[PDB]
């Protein structure tokens, strides 16, 4: 045997059930699974009725206390590749007056002015009630939410917050009651809900390659610059004669830049520089077009190269 880690410590609350299966990546195999106690002892019981114990390849806690808050193990060795997984769990008590402990919050965000969903974590095991995730009750700041389908909707593990506002911020809790061996235990998760600014869709504005002409000498080299005014997730690129500029092109080359506007990020500037090392006969036939694109539509503007006037 060798060793395996798992630095992320899942902090569950004491007073309720909890399961902790071992993290098996693509390779699991069903005939290797076994849990162990603190400072390597025996296989943490094997009786469904005992308290801290292992059942269907999972370490259940029946009523879980704070004293359980410690380092555990699991070992996989089907043929020989033994390395015994280290876990490290923590159980907390609800803080004074609260119906939760912040040490156990899961941070979840949703953009304002639109219907979103908060998800009650780790409900994957308690699901098994004939493969039916238990009926969840929801609360924000320890008060109960009415699931009217006007202000909120509850479906499986999620809370559909209708038309998210700044006033939806707060600590939410989802509650379920899992029946284990005839006796039903409780379950809760807290979610600190943080609202994101509404995502308004806006097409970018091409400022400089505004459909014009430019006099250039047939041999020389020039720099064509596309200036766009939009968000940083908006892009700006050149295409010449129905085609993009290839990275492996010997005379054409792009250089991309961005500069966020501190005062209004929806009005930042994209700068795409086209460097023509040697102007060729062909560049006078078709214009160099510049495209401002995002998911909500493109924008075009060209520069038609022409020979100088005699």
């Amino acid at each position: 045997c060798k060793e395996r880690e798992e630095k992320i410590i899942l902090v569950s609350s004491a007073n309720e059930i909890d399961v902790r299966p071992c993290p098996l990546n693509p390779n699991e195999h069903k005939g290797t699974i076994t849990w162990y106690k603190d400072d390597s002892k025996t296989p943490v019981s094997t009786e469904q009725a005992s308290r801290i114990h292992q059942h269907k390849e999972k370490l259940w806690f029946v009523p879980a206390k704070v004293e359980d808050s410690g380092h555990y193990y699991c070992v996989v060795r089907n043929s020989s590749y033994c390395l015994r997984i280290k876990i490290s769990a923590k159980f907390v008590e609800n803080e004074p007056n609260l119906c939760y402990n912040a040490q156990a919050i899961f941070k979840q965000k949703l953009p304002v002015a639109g219907d979103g969903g908060l998800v009650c974590p780790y409900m994957e095991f308690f699901k098994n009630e004939n493969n039916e995730l238990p009926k969840l009750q929801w609360y924000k700041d320890c008060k109960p939410l009415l699931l009217d389908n006007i202000h909120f909707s509850g479906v499986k593990d999620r809370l559909i917050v209708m038309n998210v506002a700044e006033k939806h911020r707060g600590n939410y809790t989802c509650h379920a009651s899992y029946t284990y061996l005839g006796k039903q235990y409780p379950i809760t998760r807290v979610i600190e809900f943080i609202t994101l600014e509404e995502n308004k869709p806006t097409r970018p504005v091409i400022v400089s390659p505004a459909n014009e002409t430019m006099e250039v000498d047939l041999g020389s080299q020039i720099q064509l610059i596309c200036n766009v005014t939009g968000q940083l997730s908006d892009i700006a690129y050149w295409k010449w004669n129905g085609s993009v500029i290839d990275e492996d092109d010997p005379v054409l080359g792009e250089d991309y830049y961005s500069v966020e506007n501190p005062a209004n990020k929806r009005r930042s500037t994209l700068i795409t520089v086209l460097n023509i090392s040697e102007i060729e006969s062909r560049f006078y036939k078709h214009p160099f077009t510049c495209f401002a694109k995002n998911t909500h539509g493109i924008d075009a503007a060209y520069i038609q190269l022409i020979y100088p006037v005699t």
């Binding site: 990546n25 899961f106 639109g114 990275e247 966020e260 694109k293």
Partner: protein
């Protein structure tokens, strides 16, 4: 800069974040308010491919970790994998098809279809702490929808 790149975070539609499940593999789970720095920052490059307007080709690589999500045939089945590349040569705007995903935005909801293997998207399971993979049924029950957060701060 030769290629246009942005730093983002990605969370699936079920609110699960993504993290390293031992370098060369990723996994999605809901993270507690303390471990929030465990999530992988991506370097989404706008690579050139089939710009269909309703799709935007991209390259997804782990920040300053020199790893790029690619799609290869493993056992005659399209599969996701993380592979290291040369930091000097990468990222390129002319990316090999395997690392290329078309970023599709429906209702402010992101899907990443594989340019190499169309009808196969970056997916996650409803399950907690399972790996990030390439899923082919899309709505089979597996999550193919995500959200993006830019690291402008």
């Amino acid at each position: 800069a030769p290629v246009r790149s942005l730093n983002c975070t990605l969370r699936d539609s079920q609110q699960k974040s993504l993290v390293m499940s031992g370098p060369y593999e990723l996994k999605a789970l809901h993270l507690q308010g303390q471990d929030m720095e465990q999530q992988v920052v991506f370097s989404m490059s706008f690579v050139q491919g089939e710009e269909s307007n309703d799709k935007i080709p991209v390259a997804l690589g782990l920040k300053e970790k020199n790893l790029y999500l690619s799609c290869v045939l493993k056992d005659d089945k399209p599969t996701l994998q993380l592979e290291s590349v040369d930091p000097k040569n990468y990222p390129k705007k002319k990316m090999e098809k395997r690392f290329v995903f078309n970023k599709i935005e429906i209702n402010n909801k992101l899907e990443f279809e594989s340019a190499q293997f169309p009808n196969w998207y970056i997916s996650t399971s409803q399950a907690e702490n399972m790996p990030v993979f390439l899923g082919g049924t899309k709505g089979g029950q597996d999550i193919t929808d995500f959200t993006m957060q830019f690291v402008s701060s």
